[PDB]
């Protein structure tokens, strides 16, 4: 992927959802590496799932960052080096 | 899956190639990525190192060791496999050569003896093959600079540019099309840093990256002065602090 | 220009040659489109 | 039948032939096609190489052709790691004869000795046998030039023009059609390059992947000399024969 | 001094200290004056150790000749270097003659001397290295026709040489030729040959290598083709990708090349009409790269005119900034599109109620003259 | 439901986050419509057998008000021709007729697994279950008024194809 | 498992004997902490309290190879005592043949090379424990080298053995980041134990008494293990500062 090329996915999903003006879209394109639109769409969708937990219809910057750490990796077996080979 | 006879080192493989050999490369492929670039005036090697815990010491891990002052080495794989192999390889190099010809072994003789231990590891029963792949870079007065890719099967072949580990196939196409034999060592260092950076972009500094080159003699590393005849060590391992200086000029 | 081209690859390279003609909006396939079509079928047949 | 023990060489197969020898012939065909030529004035050796990668250095490395002594040079086909064990063993035993009798070892003695060394693993002990296709090329004062081939079964057979590796039956027919009883040196070189055109999968017939060595009795002072021609000189004879 | 290495460092500081005429005599004293020993092939002095400092001096002096008006002398100095090609740097004319022509690209110069030099030294003995390298000097000729604004001679030189471009000379040279070929049909309003040459350039880009300026131009030429085809969501996607490559060039990038990219990125934002994202480019110093002027700031007022949808503020900044804002040819095609877009939105407000209203009352709602409204309204 | 909140006590921190993505779309579907997102479908509750599987099953349906559907995975894979094909369809048809319902399962480790290439080898009813459950939630018609619940010992014993986003968005361990 | 019967790399490129070798390390469920002061190295191991039929004083997870050198083993006990007697043999034989103090770098490297010999022998079981060697070097100073059951050894600023190592590293990473040093202040070795106890309780989340823990102290040319009464004096010394 590319930093600017992925932004087409970020900007498209963000147009169909409500986001605060303090939300930084450049922090997602730099940190994410080799990911598809399905993972990106789950980030903005989790932001709404984190918003309904707080009973706030407007997604703020806090709900955007808290939703990124959950959807960044779906693999539970990662660990780090714990099991060699 | 099919036949265990391919896995048994005392039994010939029904498929024509020992399954223990092909799946040992998978263990090497699961490891980190190590590569090398052979030029006319020198050979550069670069690899990525295990970070482990955030409190782990980055200066403890050294993946580039010293065999002879004219020959370097780099490995990717298990920790003890390289240690036990080279600890015996340094003894065979001294006994079969330095205790006979009284010098440091050349490139063709040293690499041939390293693969012989892997041959016995894949032959005698009960001894598992090594899970490491050694990329040996050296310079002599006969063949000159040489870069040999040593596979755990025990078969070595010369390579101008090669890579091992998970990025073996990925960097092989890169190093083939990017690099040409007519270039120098200075351009080889910059290309080695760009290809290795593609493996992980998190930390490219000298803490997780080791860099070493081969070339002419260094008078500061000889340890003694007054003899013009004996040249200094041809191998120079760059300190992690000096690696960052090369990265700023990349 | 090729080696051991099967009957499936002949119909494939002719299909590729017709794709470059649609981009040029020409009912005829020019000789330039064949050189681009042969280059694709050689790499496609080389894989696997 | 359904019950087969391939683990130990000591267990006899229901058919009577060890299965390790059956599939060892496949590993020979998986490697490059090597063609030996036995002539009256010398021995012509031409063979391809298994590695097709351009990054590998084929000028300074020989995967098949290896020189045992001045009068004997052999071409190995099989596992590379298992080949160096038998190559060094053949060179140590060849020097023991020269260290004792102060003479060059005949071909028939070296061929029969190496056949039993490979057979010793299958005959006794649990060690793995090494399937390898050997091309035996040498000269002596007894029978003259002798061309022998070592099968994984552990025996040897005399041959005039023989090929191993891929297209074994295809290359053997091409050599016999143009075969000559005298086998002129200049005709044997053109016969090798002509057969390697159809047999090898590479139609361009690159020089870097070829091993060209020619033995000639008409050398200086009437002696048998072995010269290993560099790949740069291999490209020259391709133009003379009409390949390029 | 009387040393080849001392005259280079000493005369470097004498340019701003006194003048460039006295410092020029220092380099000329190393070339013609004295320096004769043994035998060598040079054409001015005689030595094997003077070839390094004399050819380096020509590269430094050649840049000062075009700036100070000495180009009339420099054009005849290059063909006199033919004798150096048989000695210095073991032939390799591409490392000398091509660099001397490159000196004319940085400093603005007329096309009379730039074309004469490339067709002069090629006729001398330098053609021995130019046998297979004749494509290099041919590309420099076709490049000079772009400033001439004549695409007939540039296209003729390319087409006749296309038969030798496929695997007969230089493999990566294709993308460099196919890229410049797309600019030929771009001004000719031909989208069939422009997209075809760009497709062959982008497809073969993975089969060969290109420098930083060429790779970034592949996206610049791809995104500019989305102006007439609309689809402005993916149009700027290729514009910001090229800016990342142009930002790291620094000195390698000029002021005009980076300023046009800033105008191309803001152009797609106006067509897509995003008010929050158009000002973030000028606010953030990373994407701005410190480029601001009257015409650059006028582009923000164009996007603000779409908010209220009025032609009063649209034509106000259009006629006042026309010296700059209207200087670009690509944006000029979009000015009438934005003029008709804001006008059509105001016309629908009149057409929505019942018809049969005074035309003079229509011009008062639009805000222009009666003759100006009747011409544009009847056009739609 | 049946089981009350007093038995599931101690999970309140986790249950509070689960009720927001479950109880809310069942009661007022217009909450997430104004935000522009979609509620999750699958929620994985895994732990020791018999501990937390029965309690959390009937407790969620008690607080929401939706009917309790218990359809264990042990009623799927058998020896029959197309059994798992008609089990999910009839289960989807029952949830389509009555909106206020929530489907619960048990012992889903036997119907899962990725094999190697994610085909069928000597297991007939496993692959038909893996694909059909994927096509119901990601298809044109999903269950917005019905949530799919699965129970197993460990999530690593299931098929990663069903653990991807779009179907199962929640992994909750029962300690 | 057709290929599972033996110890080889398997067709999946994964060693299944290492899979159960790491699981045996947590069988005892003992959490230890190893920290290094400026001039000193202090290690602390959790001492489990069995029933009245056993002596807690005799129970020790930290073995003394020689002076200044110590070994922290977390895992199966029968493999710990056999490796403890073996590690001491290489320490004494190295001081004879080479006549030099065996450093913890080579001491962890020798066990790593000896671990492959265990895997090389099909009739011998590899070490299923966690070998953590600490000492004070004359040149490098305090150093920690932990040998994994697979033979990996690398230096650690502050290491740990247990399931809580993830939480132990987090609290100790920000502590060394603000000071930008890997050593604890208060060069006096008596005060170093105060921090080693403080940072461990907050990391593990459970406070322990003198009978639930054991504290080793490795100084220059001296090594000793604090008794039950000396550990109680450490908790009292924390309040006095």
From Swiss-Prot, chain A:
Subcellular location field: Cytoplasm; Nucleus
Gene field: RPT3
Organism, scientific name: Saccharomyces cerevisiae (strain ATCC 204508 / S288c)
Residues of the full protein shown: 344 to 428 of 428
Post-translation changes: N-acetylated by NAT3.
Function text: The 26S proteasome is involved in the ATP-dependent degradation of ubiquitinated proteins. The regulatory (or ATPase) complex confers ATP dependency and substrate specificity to the 26S complex.
Family designation: Belongs to the AAA ATPase family.
Name of the protein in question: 26S proteasome regulatory subunit 6B homolog
Swiss-Prot record, chain B:
PROSITE patterns (alphabetical): PROTEASOME_ALPHA_1, PROTEASOME_ALPHA_2
Biological-process GO terms, alphabetical: proteasomal ubiquitin-independent protein catabolic process; proteasome-mediated ubiquitin-dependent protein catabolic process
Location in or out of the cell: Cytoplasm; Nucleus
Domain of life, source organism: Eukaryota
GO cellular component: nucleus; proteasome complex; proteasome core complex, alpha-subunit complex; proteasome storage granule
Coiled-coil zones: none
Crosslink site: Glycyl lysine isopeptide (Lys-Gly) (interchain with G-Cter in ubiquitin): 108
InterPro entries according to UniProt: Ntn_hydrolases_N (IPR029055), Proteasome_alpha (IPR050115), Proteasome_alpha-type (IPR023332), Proteasome_asu_N (IPR000426), Proteasome_sua/b (IPR001353)
General function of this protein: The proteasome degrades poly-ubiquitinated proteins in the cytoplasm and in the nucleus. It is essential for the regulated turnover of proteins and for the removal of misfolded proteins. The proteasome is a multicatalytic proteinase complex that is characterized by its ability to cleave peptides with Arg, Phe, Tyr, Leu, and Glu adjacent to the leaving group at neutral or slightly basic pH. It has an ATP-dependent proteolytic activity.
Extra facts: Present with 7060 molecules/cell in log phase SD medium.
Family designation: Belongs to the peptidase T1A family.
Name under which the protein is recorded: Proteasome subunit alpha type-2
Organism: Saccharomyces cerevisiae (strain ATCC 204508 / S288c) (Baker's yeast)
Gene this chain is encoded by: PRE8
From Swiss-Prot, chain D:
CDD domains to which the protein is assigned, alphabetical: proteasome_alpha_type_4
Source organism superkingdom: Eukaryota
UniProt keywords, alphabetically: Cytoplasm, Isopeptide bond, Nucleus, Proteasome, Ubl conjugation
UniProt key word Amino-acid biosynthesis: no
Main location: cytoplasm
Gene3D superfamilies listed in its UniProt record: Glutamine Phosphoribosylpyrophosphate, subunit 1, domain 1
Ubl conjugation found in the keyword field: yes
Miscellaneous note of the record: Present with 17100 molecules/cell in log phase SD medium.
Family indicated by similarity: Belongs to the peptidase T1A family.
Function: The proteasome degrades poly-ubiquitinated proteins in the cytoplasm and in the nucleus. It is essential for the regulated turnover of proteins and for the removal of misfolded proteins. The proteasome is a multicatalytic proteinase complex that is characterized by its ability to cleave peptides with Arg, Phe, Tyr, Leu, and Glu adjacent to the leaving group at neutral or slightly basic pH. It has an ATP-dependent proteolytic activity.
Subunit structure: The 26S proteasome consists of a 20S proteasome core and two 19S regulatory subunits. The 20S proteasome core is composed of 28 subunits that are arranged in four stacked rings, resulting in a barrel-shaped structure. The two end rings are each formed by seven alpha subunits, and the two central rings are each formed by seven beta subunits. The catalytic chamber with the active sites is on the inside of the barrel.
Protein name: Proteasome subunit alpha type-3
Taxonomic source organism: Saccharomyces cerevisiae (strain ATCC 204508 / S288c) (Baker's yeast)
UniProtKB/Swiss-Prot annotation, chain G:
Modification sites for Phosphoserine: 227
Top-level taxon: Eukaryota
Pfam families in alphabetical order: Proteasome (PF00227), Proteasome_A_N (PF10584)
UniProt keyword annotations, A-Z: Acetylation, Cytoplasm, Isopeptide bond, Nucleus, Phosphoprotein, Proteasome, Ubl conjugation
Cellular localisation: Cytoplasm; Nucleus
Cross-link (Glycyl lysine isopeptide (Lys-Gly) (interchain with G-Cter in ubiquitin)): 222
Cysteines engaged in disulfide bonds, as pairs: none
GO biological-process terms attached to the record: proteasomal ubiquitin-independent protein catabolic process; proteasome-mediated ubiquitin-dependent protein catabolic process
Cellular component annotations (GO), alphabetically ordered: mitochondrion; nucleus; proteasome complex; proteasome core complex, alpha-subunit complex
Keyword rRNA processing applies: no
Similarity section: Belongs to the peptidase T1A family.
Subunit structure: The 26S proteasome consists of a 20S proteasome core and two 19S regulatory subunits. The 20S proteasome core is composed of 28 subunits that are arranged in four stacked rings, resulting in a barrel-shaped structure. The two end rings are each formed by seven alpha subunits, and the two central rings are each formed by seven beta subunits. The catalytic chamber with the active sites is on the inside of the barrel. Interacts with CIC1.
Miscellaneous section: Present with 15200 molecules/cell in log phase SD medium.
Protein name: Proteasome subunit alpha type-1
